[PDB]
Amino acid sequence: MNHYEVLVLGGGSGGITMAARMKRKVGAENVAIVEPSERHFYQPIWTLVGAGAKQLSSSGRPTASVIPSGVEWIKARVTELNPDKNCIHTDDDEKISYRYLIIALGIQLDYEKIKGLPEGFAHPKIGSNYSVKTVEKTWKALQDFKEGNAIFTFPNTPVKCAGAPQEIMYLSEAYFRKTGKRSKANIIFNTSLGAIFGVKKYADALQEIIQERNLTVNYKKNLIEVRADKQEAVFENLDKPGETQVISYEMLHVTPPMSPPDVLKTSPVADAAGWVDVDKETLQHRRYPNVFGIGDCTNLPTSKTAAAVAAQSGILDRTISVIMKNQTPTKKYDGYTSCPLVTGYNRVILAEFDYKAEPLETFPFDQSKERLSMYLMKADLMPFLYWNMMLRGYWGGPAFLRKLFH
Amino acid sequence: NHYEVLVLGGGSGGITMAARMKRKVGAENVAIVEPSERHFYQPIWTLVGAGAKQLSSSGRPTASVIPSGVEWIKARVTELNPDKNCIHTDDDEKISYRYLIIALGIQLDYEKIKGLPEGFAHPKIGSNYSVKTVEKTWKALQDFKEGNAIFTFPNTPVKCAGAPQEIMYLSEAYFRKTGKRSKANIIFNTSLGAIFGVKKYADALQEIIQERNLTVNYKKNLIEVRADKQEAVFENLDKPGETQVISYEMLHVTPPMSPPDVLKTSPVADAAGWVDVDKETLQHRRYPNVFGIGDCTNLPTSKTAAAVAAQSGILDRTISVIMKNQTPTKKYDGYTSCPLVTGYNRVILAEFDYKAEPLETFPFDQSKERLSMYLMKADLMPFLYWNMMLRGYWGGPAFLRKLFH
Ligand SMILES: Cc1cc2nc3c(=O)[nH]c(=O)nc-3n(C[C@H](O)[C@H](O)[C@H](O)COP(=O)(O)OP(=O)(O)OC[C@H]3O[C@@H](n4cnc5c(N)ncnc54)[C@H](O)[C@@H]3O)c2cc1C
Numbered sequence: 001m002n003h004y005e006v007l008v009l010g011g012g013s014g015g016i017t018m019a020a021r022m023k024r025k026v027g028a029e030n031v032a033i034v035e036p037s038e039r040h041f042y043q044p045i046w047t048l049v050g051a052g053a054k055q056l057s058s059s060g061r062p063t064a065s066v067i068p069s070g071v072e073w074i075k076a077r078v079t080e081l082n083p084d085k086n087c088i089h090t091d092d093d094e095k096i097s098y099r100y101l102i103i104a105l106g107i108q109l110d111y112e113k114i115k116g117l118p119e120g121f122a123h124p125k126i127g128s129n130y131s132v133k134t135v136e137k138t139w140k141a142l143q144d145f146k147e148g149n150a151i152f153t154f155p156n157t158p159v160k161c162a163g164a165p166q167e168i169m170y171l172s173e174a175y176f177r178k179t180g181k182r183s184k185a186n187i188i189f190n191t192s193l194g195a196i197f198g199v200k201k202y203a204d205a206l207q208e209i210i211q212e213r214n215l216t217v218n219y220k221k222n223l224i225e226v227r228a229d230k231q232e233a234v235f236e237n238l239d240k241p242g243e244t245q246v247i248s249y250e251m252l253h254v255t256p257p258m259s260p261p262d263v264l265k266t267s268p269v270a271d272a273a274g275w276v277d278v279d280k281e282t283l284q285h286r287r288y289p290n291v292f293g294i295g296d297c298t299n300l301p302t303s304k305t306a307a308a309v310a311a312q313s314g315i316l317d318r319t320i321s322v323i324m325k326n327q328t329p330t331k332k333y334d335g336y337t338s339c340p341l342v343t344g345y346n347r348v349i350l351a352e353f354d355y356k357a358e359p360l361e362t363f364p365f366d367q368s369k370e371r372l373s374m375y376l377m378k379a380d381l382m383p384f385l386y387w388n389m390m391l392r393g394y395w396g397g398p399a400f401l402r403k404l405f406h
Numbered sequence: 407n408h409y410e411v412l413v414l415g416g417g418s419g420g421i422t423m424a425a426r427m428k429r430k431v432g433a434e435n436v437a438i439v440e441p442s443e444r445h446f447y448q449p450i451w452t453l454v455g456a457g458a459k460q461l462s463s464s465g466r467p468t469a470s471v472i473p474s475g476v477e478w479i480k481a482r483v484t485e486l487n488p489d490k491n492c493i494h495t496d497d498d499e500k501i502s503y504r505y506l507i508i509a510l511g512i513q514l515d516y517e518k519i520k521g522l523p524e525g526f527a528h529p530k531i532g533s534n535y536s537v538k539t540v541e542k543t544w545k546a547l548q549d550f551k552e553g554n555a556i557f558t559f560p561n562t563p564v565k566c567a568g569a570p571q572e573i574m575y576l577s578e579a580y581f582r583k584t585g586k587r588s589k590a591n592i593i594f595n596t597s598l599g600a601i602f603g604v605k606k607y608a609d610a611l612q613e614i615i616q617e618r619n620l621t622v623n624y625k626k627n628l629i630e631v632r633a634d635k636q637e638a639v640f641e642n643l644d645k646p647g648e649t650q651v652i653s654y655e656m657l658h659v660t661p662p663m664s665p666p667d668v669l670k671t672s673p674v675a676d677a678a679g680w681v682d683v684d685k686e687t688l689q690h691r692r693y694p695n696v697f698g699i700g701d702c703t704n705l706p707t708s709k710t711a712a713a714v715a716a717q718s719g720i721l722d723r724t725i726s727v728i729m730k731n732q733t734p735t736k737k738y739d740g741y742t743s744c745p746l747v748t749g750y751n752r753v754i755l756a757e758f759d760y761k762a763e764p765l766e767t768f769p770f771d772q773s774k775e776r777l778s779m780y781l782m783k784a785d786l787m788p789f790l791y792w793n794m795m796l797r798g799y800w801g802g803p804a805f806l807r808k809l810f811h
C-alpha cells in the first residue's frame with residue numbers, strides 16, 4: 001500500500017490549510033492530499049460575482065498552485081474509508097494507508113433533489129451562487145431582470161454560509177435601485193427556516209433592512225421544483241404537509257439542498273447523519289483516535305464557514321501535535337464562526353458568533369451596523385490574506401486580535 | 407428478471423403492499439426483495455423487554471407472510487437506478503420493473519455510540535429496538551438491585567417515538583411490584599426538548615411523570631457506553647462540548663437511526679437519504695413510477711406501523727389510478743399512532759395527523775390510561791396485524807372513526 005504519515009482528504013480550504021500546518025510538523029514528504037478538482041476556490045467571493053461586483057476568474061487558482069511545496073497531491077476521489085485498518089480507497093483503485101488522517105471533504109451540493117434541476121440552469125432568469133457553473137448565471141439574470149418576482153430560496157438542509165442566500169437578495173435589491181427598476185421588482189425570500197438568522201443581535205439588524213427595503217420573507221417555505229421552461233417555481237409549505245405553491249419569477253436564485261459528501265454518508269467515520277463524528281472541543285474523532293475532521297464535513301454544531309475552518313485549524317494543529325506525543329489535548333474549540341453579510345455594494349454586517357449562538361466580535365465597535373470598513377475587509381483584504389496567509393497555515397482564530405482590541 | 411410491481415423490503419409496508427398489488431396485477435407479476443428469514447411485528451418487543459410477552463410470539467418466518475404466488479427474492483438491494491427502472495441485489499442480480507415500491511424501513515446504528523454494540527455482551531444494558539438485545543432489557547430489569555435506571559432517546563429520527571419512554575413506565579411499575587422502587591433513580595435522558603410532540607398526550611405523560619417521580623433530562627444525548635464500568639456518557643446539546651458521565655444499574659438504549667445505507671446515496675432519496683415522495687399521494691416526486699411507504703420515506707409524521715397501514719390504503723389507490731392513466735384523488739392525512747404502554751395494564755392510545763393534532767378513533771378521551779386500549783394493543787392488534795393488515799385488508803381507521811362517532 002502507498003502510505004503517508006499524514007493523509008489529508010480534500011484539497012479545499014480546510015484540507016490545504018491543515019496540509020500546510022502538517023508539513024511543518026512531520027515534513028512535506030510525509031503528507032499527501034487527495035483532491036480530484038483542478039481548481040481551488042475562495043468561495044466567499046461568489047456572492048459578489050453573482051452580483052456583478054467581482055470576476056469569477058479572481059476567485060480561483062489551480063489546485064497545483066496552493067498545494068504546499070513538496071506535499072504529494074493525489075488527483076483522485078476518495079471512494080471508501082476503512083479506519084479500522086487505517087486506509088482509504090480512491091477512484092484510481094489505489095489503496096492508501098496512513099498513520100494520521102485528516103478529513104476535509106466539505107459539503108455536497110444536491111441540486112438534482114430539486115425537480116427540474118440542474119437541467120433548468122440551461123434557461124435564463126435562474127442562477128445559483130453556490131456553484132462555479134451557475135454563479136455567473138445569477139448576474140446575468142440580475143442584469144436581464146425587467147419586471148416581476150425576484151425570488152431567493154433557502155433549503156431544508158444544513159448549508160455552508162447561511163448568510164449567502166440573503167446577501168444576494170440585498171445586493172439584488174440594491175442593483176434594482178441603482179438601475180431605476182426597483183419599482184418593477186417584487187422581492188421574495190422563501191426560506192425553509194423559521195427565522196432570518198440564528199443570532200438575535202444580527203437577526204434584528206437584518207429585519208430592519210427587510211422592513212426599510214420592502215422585502216417579503218415567507219418562512220417555512222421550501223423550494224421543491226423549478227419549471228425553468230415556464231419560469232415557474234413550486235414551493236412546499238413545511239408547516240402544512242401536502243400544500244404547495246406555484247409562483248412565477250423574473251429571476252430566481254437557488255440555494256441547493258446540501259448533504260455530507262456521498263463517500264462519508266455510509267462511512268464508519270460518520271455519525272448517524274453522515275457527518276464526520278468528532279469531539280466538539282478538540283476535533284479528534286470520537287471512535288478512531290488517529291482520525292481528525294475539519295470544516296463543512298464535520299458534525300461540529302456551528303455555522304459551516306471558512307472563518308470557522310481557520311479557527312478550527314488552529315485547534316486541530318494543537319490537538320494533533322499533542323496526540324503525537326501521546327498527551328491529552330487541552331485547547332478547546334469554542335465554535336467560532338463568521339458570516340460577513342454583504343448588505344449592499346458597499347456595506348457589510350460582520351456577524352461573528354460561537355457555539356452558544358452569541359456574538360463574539362473581533363472589533364470593539366458594533367458590527368451589527370452596516371459598515372463600509374467591513375465591506376472593504378471582505379471584498380479586498382480577506383481574499384488576499386486567504387491565499388497568502390490562511391492557505392499557508394498562518395491564520396487561526398481572530399481571538400488574538402479580538403483580545404488585543406479588548 | 408422483470409416484474410410489473412417490485413417491492414423492496416419484506417417488512418410491514420412491503421408485505422402489506424405486495425398483498426394489495428397481488429390483487430391488482432396478479433401474484434405472478436409481484437416480487438419482494440427481502441434478505442431476512444424472520445418477519446416481526448415490532449411493537450410486541452416493548453412488552454418483551456418488560457417481560458410481559460415472549461419474543462417467540464413477535465415473529466414468524468418471512469416465508470409464512472409472503473402472499474401466495476408472489477416471488478420472494480431473498481437478497482439485499484444494493485443499488486437503485488430508477489432512470490433505467492432497475493435495481494441490483496447482493497446476488498449480482500439486476501431486476502427491472504414497471505413500478506417500484508420502496509419499503510426498506512429504518513436502519514439502526516448502534517455503532518455510532520462508542521462502546522456499542524460490543525457493550526451488549528455485558529450485563530445491565532438492553533435495547534428493545536433489536537431482536538438481539540430486547541431480551542437483555544428484560545434481564546436488566548430482573549437483575550436491577552440499586553442505582554440509576556437510564557432510558558435514552560437519540561438525536562435522529564426514530565420509529566415509534568413512544569417506545570423509548572414506554573419501557574421506562576413499565577420499568578417503573580416493575581420496581582413497585584418487586585419492592586425496589588425505593589432503590590431506583592429513573593431518568594429519561596432525551597435529545598429532545600419535550601416529552602411528546604402532541605400536547606394532549608404530552609400533558610398526560612407529564613402528569614404521569616410527576617406522580618411517579620420520574621426525571622426527564624432534556625437535550626441530553628447518549629454518545630458512549632462503558633459497559634464494563636456501567637457508565638454512560640451524554641452530550642449536552644444545549645452546550646456543545648459539555649458531557650456528563652453517569653453510572654447506571656440499568657441502561658436502555660434507543661439507538662441512533664438513519665435511512666438504509668443503500669438509500670443514503672440513491673437518486674430516489676432526498677438530500678437527507680429518505681425516499682422523496684409526495685406527502686399526499688406517496689408517489690415519488692421525480693420518478694413517477696416509484697413509490698415509498700413506511701419508515702424509509704420522508705413523510706413528515708411519526709414512523710409507526712399504524713402510519714404504514716393508513717399509507718397502504720392511499721398508496722393502493724395512488725398506484726391503481728396511475729395504472730388507469732388518471733391523477734390521484736385521495737390524500738394521505740399523515741395519520742399515525744403510538745399506543746403508549748404506561749403500565750402492565752394500561753395504554754394511552756395517541757393518534758394524530760400531519761398537523762400534530764389528535765385524531766382519535768374512539769369517541770372517549772384516549773389521553774387517559776385505559777385497560778381497554780392495553781388489551782387492544784397487547785392481544786387484538788397482533789392478531790389483526792398477521793391476519794388482516796398483512797393480507798391487505800387494513801388501511802386507515804377513518805371508517806371506524808366515523809362509525810364509532
Ligand atoms: C456562495 C458562498 C459564499 C460563501 N461565503 C462565505 C463567507 O463570506 N464567509 C465564510 O467564512 N464562508 C463562506 N462560505 C463558506 C466557505 O466557502 C466554506 O465553509 C469553506 O470552503 C469550507 O471549507 P472545507 O475545506 O470544509 O470545504 P471546501 O473548501 O468546499 O473543500 C472541500 C473539498 O473536498 C473535495 N472533495 C469532495 N468530495 C471529495 C471526495 N470524495 N474525495 C476527495 N475530495 C473530495 C472538493 O473537491 C473540495 O475541494 C461561502 C460558501 C458559498 C457557497
Ligand SMILES: Cc1cc2nc3c(=O)[nH]c(=O)nc-3n(C[C@H](O)[C@H](O)[C@H](O)COP(=O)(O)OP(=O)(O)OC[C@H]3O[C@@H](n4cnc5c(N)ncnc54)[C@H](O)[C@@H]3O)c2cc1C
Nearest residue numbers: 415417418419448449482483510511566700701710711712
Ligand atoms: C420497539 C418498537 C416498538 C414499536 N411499537 C410500535 C407500536 O406500538 N405501534 C406502531 O404503530 N409502530 C410501532 N413501532 C414501529 C413499527 O414497527 C414500524 O414503524 C414499522 O415496522 C415500519 O414498517 P416498514 O415496512 O416501513 O419497515 P420494517 O417493518 O422494519 O421493514 C423493513 C424491511 O426492509 C428490509 N430491508 C432493509 N434493508 C434492505 C435492503 N437493503 N434490501 C432489502 N431489504 C431490506 C428489512 O429486513 C425489513 O424486513 C415500533 C418499533 C419498535 C422498534
Ligand SMILES: NC(=O)CN(CC(=O)O)CC(=O)O
Nearest residue numbers: 207210211214215216217218
Ligand atoms: N414580510 C414583509 O413584507 C414584512 N414583514 C417582515 C417579515 O416577514 O419578517 C413584517 C413587517 O414588516 O411588519
Ligand SMILES: NC(=O)CN(CC(=O)O)CC(=O)O
Nearest residue numbers: 789790792793794795797799
Ligand atoms: N381471521 C381472519 O380475519 C381471516 N384469517 C383467518 C385466520 O388466520 O384466522 C385469514 C384467512 O382468510 O384465512
